């Protein structure tokens, strides 16, 4: 019993934070085998940042202009070159802590775990979703930037996510592993704006399974609905629309619970048009999007890595 | 900007969790230099849970009855006592991978990371709270005897719990690395029930001072209270009583936001009378209480 928003053990992902510097600016790299990845604007200063062209401020750079610091060895810079928004520091040493990896590109709704780190140094590990507007409500102070998104799967270390920036709301921006950003963003201090977020459908539909996984019911009913019927209600909320590919992974805990997933989609309908009434699901008062169906399972079965 | 409940990176801990087995009983334990500690109800078998003579089922093995499972590599158990309610198995290899560690004793209010894990093998990592009634709300199967909660300040690893039951209502309860159960429990069958829970008012001040240093103010108003009248109005809503170390360890937190404690109290008093009329404070509806003062300053 128990539900809680669950990270992934960081200790395959701590071995690879590495401290990068060129010049003044001190962010985050991950050092996987003899490369290091880090955000491509530690080679900007605050006046190149406004309008920055890398393949110009990179040509300027020489290797002995990136210090890379693996703990308290300084890594020797032996190459570099940019792949979109990230910069591949090519190094001599190889990290013997490199883990079974892949870089993979999520897509919003998907969730995975941040360790937060400042001057190369793992701080903090967090759980959190790739928001619907592509943007991720985490926690990040400045010299976050480079701390990694990842997911594990078995032993294979799954890299999804590279911090880049902060919006003015408070929400983050960040890259998959190749440097493609998530959402509509540029890597330039300019007017940048994250779009109306909505609520992921999906995976609030599965944290009501684990709800009832965990004997919270108040919120079942006798009432079924159309997929349909229940998108109409849904956009009316700022709700994803949800899919038959959604109704497909939700399948497993419809069998659980024996709550079929328009059954749950009812619930969650009567819970969008009339709130819950000083109850509260899971110990919040608010509906949890932040939990896709695997999540659930993961952690309603335990599945260890 | 943003705030969210972080765990500490389990690195450190992750490679220190064995799998220990006693006949049928697996669960997972914590092997830090040449020992292995774990729940001592690991020897425990069906007639055994409602009343156990430890010493009794302890005198009955021996080293060889101890299965240790360090990744795919058998230690050699070559020692075993009992040290309250944990398992201390000395073992003929000493952990290459133990950290800087210490076994501290918390309070309730204080948080700590868990490492939640099944046959030796780490699953997940979550923060969460010592509640007033010593019971953690955890998030654990069965096979997660033996997991632990920890803090990590400055390289040190500082082991708090082992977890070893669940109680009826969901909840947890375990010991702290030495074996000393933390609230009323014990490691028995018997009926146990966890205490009426209180919110922790200190954690959820330290957590209000966190969404003012976050921009939100919304909650703030013109007035003051006396700490006894707080804790009067408080009491009410079954919150904690603040004590005058509590205002005291909020002291930072007030100079930095310039809300006095008593003024941030007002506040709480009034977000209790009220609500929250449909807003959220740091993305949440409800008042959150698992972030101690220290947290807040550490994470804002
Ligand atoms: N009688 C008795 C007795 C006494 C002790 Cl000290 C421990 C246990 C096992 C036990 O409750 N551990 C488990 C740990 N965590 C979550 C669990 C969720 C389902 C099932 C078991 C869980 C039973
Ligand atoms: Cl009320």
């Known amino acids: 019993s128990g539900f809680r928003k669950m990270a992934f053990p960081s200790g395959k992902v701590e071995g690879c934070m590495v401290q990068v510097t060129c010049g003044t600016t001190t962010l985050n790299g991950l050092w996987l085998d003899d490369v290091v990845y880090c955000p491509r604007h530690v ?18 750079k020489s290797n002995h202009n990136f210090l890379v610091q693996a703990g308290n060895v300084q890594l020797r810079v032996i190459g570099h070159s940019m792949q979109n928004c990230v910069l591949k520091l090519k190094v001599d040493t190889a990290n013997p802590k490199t883990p079974k990896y892949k870089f993979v590109r999520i897509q919003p709704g998907q969730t995975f775990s941040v360790l937060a780190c400042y001057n190369g140094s793992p701080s903090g590990v967090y759980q959190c979703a790739m928001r619907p507007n592509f943007t991720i409500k985490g926690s990040f102070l400045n010299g976050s930037c480079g701390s990694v998104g990842f997911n594990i799967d078995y032993d294979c270390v799954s890299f999804c996510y590279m911090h880049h920036m902060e919006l003015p709301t408070g929400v983050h921006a960040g890259t998959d592993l190749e440097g493609n950003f998530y959402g509509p963003f540029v890597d330039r201090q300019t007017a940048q704006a994250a779009g109306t977020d909505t609520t992921i459908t999906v995976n609030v539909l599965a ?4 709800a009832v996984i965990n004997g919270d019911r108040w919120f079942l009913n006798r009432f079924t609905t159309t997929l349909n019927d229940f998108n109409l209600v849904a956009m009316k909320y700022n709700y994803e629309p949800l899919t038959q590919d959604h109704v497909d992974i939700l399948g497993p805990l419809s069998a659980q619970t024996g709550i079929a997933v328009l059954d749950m989609c009812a619930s969650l309908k009567e819970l969008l048009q009339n709130g819950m009434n000083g109850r509260t699901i899971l110990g919040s008062a608010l509906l949890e999007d932040e939990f896709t169906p695997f999540d659930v399972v993961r952690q309603c079965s335990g599945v260890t890595f």
């Open 43 to 60: 080679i900007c200063t605050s006046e190149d940042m406004l309008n920055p062209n890398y393949e110009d401020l990179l040509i300027r």
């Open 207 to 210: 944290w009501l399974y684990a």
